[PDB]
Design a protein around this nucleic acid. Structure first.
Ligand SMILES: [Zn+2]
Lengths: 60, 49, 103, 141, 145, 70, 143, 56, 54, 107, 115
RNA sequence: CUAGCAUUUGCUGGUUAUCCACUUCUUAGAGGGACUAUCGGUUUCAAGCCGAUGGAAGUUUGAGGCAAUAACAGGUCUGUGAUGCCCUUAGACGUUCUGGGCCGCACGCGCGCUACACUGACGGAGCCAGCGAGUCUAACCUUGGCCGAGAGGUCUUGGUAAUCUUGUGAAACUCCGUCGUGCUGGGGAUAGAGCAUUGUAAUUAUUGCUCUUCAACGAGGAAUUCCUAGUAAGCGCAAGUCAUCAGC
């Protein structure tokens, strides 16, 4: 199934704490933000992070 | 003290260890399959998939 | 040629007629197994209908002069009419009768 | 120069490179008509591009297809969509969009699903069987 | 091309080279009941006899039948190549032959008896009822019949 | 079932009488109903087609389907 | 219109352009005819018998038209099917080398084909005429 | 062994090393053979990073 | 010689060298080797700890 | 004699993509700096040398296989240049593990 | 042997015999004979010449199971090595064109059951 | 530029740098793209899951590779100049040459190939892949021509390879013919004779080819294996081994 690991769910919570001002309820802009503010090595993980970040922003 | 050795397993031996069995000839290696897996990455054969 | 009807309709009628409504499942409770009567889902009816038709037609064509096209046509026409000559109808009625016996 | 589009299609390893032009109205295959498709049944699957849309749009367009790779039934399906993408890529540039959407509407609403490549590629055979999923027979006793 | 034939003309059973041949079968296949005649040989003989390959064996005239028998017996005379014959360069005479009918069972026996008399490995294996062509006998040929 | 090997006048006359009555005509139909050869049956169909007694619906190398000429 | 070999079906072309060559009877039949079976991996020889070599030349004509410059080896491979090895599994075996060579010589004597440079047999100018002529004839024949 | 192994492990771990391991296997005075391990610090085991970082 | 054969043979050249120095420069503390193929020359670099008495 | 413009094919072969791209880029950049006629780096299909062995040195265990790959990356650059400039370009770009062949085009 | 009567076979050259022989025999002679066959032929000739009238010649031992029987050998006694013994066989006319090895079995028949 | 069909410019092909212009198809180098996106259901309205629509793709996107702590008296001393101890060491258990053997057949078990036919066999015709590999001082992949029923032979040529072999015109399959339910034209075992090929050597048939011989087997008892999408199964091809030999 699609269940997200710790590193996804952890780093999503860690971003939202610092930048609930900034960020939206839209994936496309979030992923491009996550490049600047966070230093991610991978490209696939960045898209996972930003996807769950959007799921949490929808709940807020 | 010698006989035909032009073709066959008697002719071809391993560079390293002098075994006739289980040779790899492909690309002119002439390394026995066991010795190949030892010296695979050294040569430049790396696993990927 | 044999029915003067839209042969697509004949295929549909054959499938509707040959689909078993009740079936038996094997239920067992620690060693011993009985047959229990159960209802059959519409998707399963269609699947069994098609299977029975194509198996019947294939067995009828095996080591016979008649071609698979002819035996399939015969099987479909007989099934559309609800004829007890059809392999598919015989097997449907057998299954439903066995279901009724294990209710 | 005359208008030109260099569309293509594919199923599996087939790659049917079409060329559409401002033409008289020829719908060619390799260098032969649409009646030159020896798959007797799969005549009608390379027909569908020009059948289910409108005859009239096929009266002023030179379509001709150069099919390479693949196998007999993959050739059919590669050509098909290279035709059905050819007119749509033509109607993109040199025809109205409201017309060009009725091409895509009439195609996609038939349960055609031309799409592009039906993305199903072969799953590799891996050691220990003759197939990808299938394994050699185990003995036990 | 339905063309009705008189019931007297058709021969249900033909006797050729001491063997019974079924007239109901097409000539090319009918002739394969004769030991030494295979499908390719039969076809060639019919083509050299100028007999139609589509005819049934019971529709053969006696003249066509005699011509077939002559071509079968003396194939070299009708320009059949040596390489097509079943016994090339016979060990006794050096001549090419096409053994037929009963001769086959005899010539076979003769070839063996020769090998037995010579005491060649192949002859000895034939004497013991063992496979001669280097086959592995550990697993294969376990029921006689 | 017995199957014909030679044409035969009585069988020829039966082919001409019976085959136009049949709604569906194929190689098997002749074999079953007319105790005929499978390959006599193919010749018969080609003859009856030439005479215009039966109409071809579909001609495939392995299966020929005919109807009566209504 | 400007008819070609390609504009006609490949089956009906071979049936017609065979019936062209056997009727006039200018083609050089090899002499083997009744003997040979046309491949190593064939079981029996052809059923047509009175013909077949005409059908082969009718194929090789049509084939050499469309391709650039074919040879015997490519023709061997084309016609040669899968040999039953009895009990072993099947494999592709390339067809009879002589009989395809005799067809290439036979069509050269009529002048349907000629010897190309860079190897192989290209279609000739008289060839194109003859094939396009029967192509236009065969199109107008059937209706 | 233990002096030698702990000796080398500590020499690695001092000079910049994020982790280390030493396995010694075989006969050592007793007849039956045994495999002692002398791990220290942090090291990953799986994936492409093995090829990148860790030196076997 | 082909490129498929040549690069493989340079691989076996490295591999022969690595194994040669390993047992030859045992006491002298051999780390490894790298080779740089130029047009004229062929450079080699024996990396080692005990670089004094090598 | 030196000023005669010669058509030359530089062929680059390597197992290591990064080095081979660096060398290829440097040759193209140097050709631009000297205003030479260049046909750019044509990337040939990568040859994948594949060897499949049994993992086990003996008969035992499940029949598991290992597949080793060596990838050979090949590129060529066509240049029209005088002999003097060509010798300069080739000498500057010698990187370890990149093989460099120079072929003079004679028709 | 293939028409040619035995008197004529004994007079015939090895080369002419080879023309009449099967494909395998022909191919072997076409590839040439080494020095070892020639030495054996010399010994057979010497043994046949030294034999009394109406006695069989002294048996010549050989390991060459691959040697082909040639007309010249007729009437000679050859000890053919089987792997442990040299078996003695007189080259009869019917053995022409066969290998020496065919007349010397390498294995003992397999007898099951019986102790 | 040039050939044919046809007059309507055409339509269909040769001439791979006579040439120009593009990079859609092809190659591979950077980057992008997917995150269950967006919406509707259903639950600790959590993780999630299910439906629908877009999308190249929504079964961890499909497939692998790498793979913890540990263990086993698992296998390997017949891969190793990895190795302890023991045995042996000139009439050798070192090594090398000749020949044989590993294949030997009342039989029991395992993996397989070919079959039992009409959805098929046979004959003509149509005619489409992908992954591969390939010789400089070595005999490698082989085109084209010529000889041959075929296997092959033979004269030259391209290729150290996206170039030449090779569009590997593969097989099943596709069409039109031929058979007609019979161990039949299904099935091709066993066996005889001959002709090639590799090799110092083919006998205990290396292998291929031609004719002939034409067995069991009419869907497989108790049992039991593999398998959920380009998958199962059918189907052939290259590679490994390889002088030659594939049912692997
Ligand atoms: Zn080794």
């Amino acid at each position: 199934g699609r269940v997200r690991t710790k590193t996804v769910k952890r780093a999503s919570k860690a971003l939202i704490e610092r930048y609930y001002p900034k960020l939206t309820l839209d994936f496309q802009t979030n992923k491009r933000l996550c490049d600047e503010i966070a230093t991610i090595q991978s490209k696939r993980l960045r898209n996972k992070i930003a996807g769950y970040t959007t799921h949490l922003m929808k709940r807020i | 003290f010698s006989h035909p050795r032009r073709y066959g397993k008697g002719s071809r031996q391993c560079r390293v260890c002098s075994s006739h069995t289980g040779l790899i000839r492909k690309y002119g290696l002439n390394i026995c399959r066991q010795c190949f897996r030892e010296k695979a990455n050294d040569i430049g054969f790396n696993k990927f998939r | 040629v044999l029915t003067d009807q839209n042969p697509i309709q004949v295929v549909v009628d054959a499938i509707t007629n040959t689909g078993p409504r009740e079936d038996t499942t094997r239920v067992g409770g620690g060693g011993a197994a009985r047959r229990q009567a159960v209802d059959v889902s519409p998707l399963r009816r269609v699947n069994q209908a098609i299977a029975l038709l194509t198996i019947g037609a294939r067995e009828a064509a095996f080591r016979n002069i008649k071609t698979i096209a002819e035996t399939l046509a015969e099987e479909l026409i007989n099934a559309a009419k609800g004829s007890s000559t059809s392999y598919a109808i015989k097997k449907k009625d057998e299954l439903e009768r066995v279901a009724k016996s294990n209710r | 120069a005359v208008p030109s589009v260099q569309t293509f299609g594919k199923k599996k390893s087939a790659t049917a490179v079409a060329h559409v032009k401002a033409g008289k109205g020829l719908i060619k295959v390799n260098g032969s008509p649409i009646t030159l498709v020896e798959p007797e049944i799969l005549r009608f699957k390379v027909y569908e591009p020009l059948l289910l849309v409108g005859l009239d749009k096929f009266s002023n367009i030179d379509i001709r297809v150069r099919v390479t790779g693949g196998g007999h039934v993959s050739q059919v399906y590669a050509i098909r969509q290279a035709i059905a993408k050819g007119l749509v890529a033509y109607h993109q540039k040199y025809v109205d969009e409201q017309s060009k959407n009725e091409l895509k509407k009439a195609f996609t609403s038939y349960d055609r699903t031309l799409l592009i490549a039906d993305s199903r590629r072969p799953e590799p055979k891996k050691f220990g069987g003759k197939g990808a999923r299938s394994r050699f027979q185990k003995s036990y006793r | 091309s339905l063309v009705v034939q008189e019931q007297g003309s058709f021969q249900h059973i033909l006797r050729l080279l001491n063997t019974n041949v079924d007239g109901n079968i097409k000539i090319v296949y009918a002739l394969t009941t004769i030991k030494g005649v295979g499908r390719r040989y039969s076809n060639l003989v019919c083509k050299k006899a100028d007999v139609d390959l589509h005819k049934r064996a019971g529709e053969l005239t006696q003249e066509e039948l005699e011509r077939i028998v002559q071509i079968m017996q003396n194939p070299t005379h009708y320009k059949i190549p040596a390489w097509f014959l079943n016994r090339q360069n016979d060990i006794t005479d050096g001549k090419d032959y096409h053994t037929l009918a009963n001769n086959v069972e005899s010539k076979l026996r003769d070839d063996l008896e020769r090998l037995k008399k010579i005491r060649a490995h192949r002859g000895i294996r034939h004497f013991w009822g063992l496979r001669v062509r280097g086959q592995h006998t550990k697993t294969t040929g376990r029921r006689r019949a | 079932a017995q199957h014909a090997v030679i044409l035969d006048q009585e069988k020829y006359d039966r082919i001409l009488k019976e085959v136009p009555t049949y709604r569906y005509v194929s190689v098997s139909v002749l074999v079953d109903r007319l105790k005929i050869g499978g390959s006599l049956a193919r010749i018969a169909l080609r003859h009856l087609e030439k005479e215009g007694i039966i109409k071809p619906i579909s001609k495939h190398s392995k299966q020929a389907i005919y109807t009566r000429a209504t | 219109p400007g008819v070609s070999v390609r504009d006609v079906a490949a089956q009906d072309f071979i049936n017609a352009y065979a019936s062209f060559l056997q009727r006039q009877g200018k083609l050089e039949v090899p002499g083997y005819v009744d003997i040979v079976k046309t491949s190593s991996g064939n079981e029996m020889p052809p059923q047509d018998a009175e013909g077949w070599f005409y059908k082969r030349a009718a194929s090789v004509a049509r084939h050499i038209y469309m391709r650039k410059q074919v040879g015997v080896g490519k023709l061997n491979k084309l016609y040669g099917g899968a040999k039953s090895r009895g009990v072993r599994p099947y494999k592709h075996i390339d067809a009879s080398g002589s009989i395809n060579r005799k067809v290439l010589q036979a069509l050269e004597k009529i002048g349907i084909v000629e010897i190309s440079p860079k190897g192989g047999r290209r279609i000739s100018e008289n060839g194109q005429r003859d094939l396009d002529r029967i192509a236009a004839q065969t199109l107008e024949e059937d209706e | 062994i233990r002096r030698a192994a702990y000796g080398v492990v500590r020499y690695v771990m001092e000079s910049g090393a994020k982790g280390c391991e030493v396995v010694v296997s075989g006969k050592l005075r007793a007849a039956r053979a045994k495999a002692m391990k002398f791990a220290d610090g942090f090291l990953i085991h799986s994936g492409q990073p093995v090829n990148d970082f860790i030196d076997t | 010689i082909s490129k498929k054969r040549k690069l493989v043979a340079d691989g076996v050249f490295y591999a022969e060298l690595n194994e040669f120095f390993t047992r030859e420069l045992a006491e002298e503390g051999y780390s490894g080797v790298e080779v740089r193929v130029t047009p004229t020359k062929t450079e080699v670099i024996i990396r080692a700890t005990r670089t004094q008495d090598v | 004699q030196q000023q005669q413009i010669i058509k030359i094919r530089i062929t680059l072969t390597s197992t290591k993509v990064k080095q081979l791209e660096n060398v290829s880029s440097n040759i193209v950049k140097n050709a631009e700096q000297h205003n030479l006629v260049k046909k750019g780096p044509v990337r040939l299909p990568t040859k994948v040398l594949k060897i499949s062995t049994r993992k086990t040195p003996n008969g035992e265990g499940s029949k598991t296989w290992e597949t080793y790959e060596m990838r050979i990356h090949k590129r060529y650059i066509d240049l029209e240049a005088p002999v003097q400039i060509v010798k300069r370009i080739t000498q500057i770009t010698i990187e370890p593990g990149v093989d460099v062949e120079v072929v003079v085009a004679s028709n | 042997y293939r028409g040619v009567d035995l008197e004529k076979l004994l007079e015939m050259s090895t080369e002419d015999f080879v023309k009449l022989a099967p494909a395998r025999v022909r191919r072997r002679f076409a590839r040439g004979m080494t020095s070892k066959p020639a030495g054996f032929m010399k010994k057979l000739r010497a043994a046949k010449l030294a034999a009394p009238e109406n006695e069989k010649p002294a048996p010549v031992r050989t390991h060459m199971r691959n040697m082909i029987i040639v007309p010249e050998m007729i009437g000679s006694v050859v000890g053919i090595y089987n792997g442990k013994a040299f078996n003695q066989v007189e080259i009869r006319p019917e053995m022409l064109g066969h290998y020496l090895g065919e007349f010397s079995i390498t294995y003992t028949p397999v007898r099951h059951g019986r102790a």
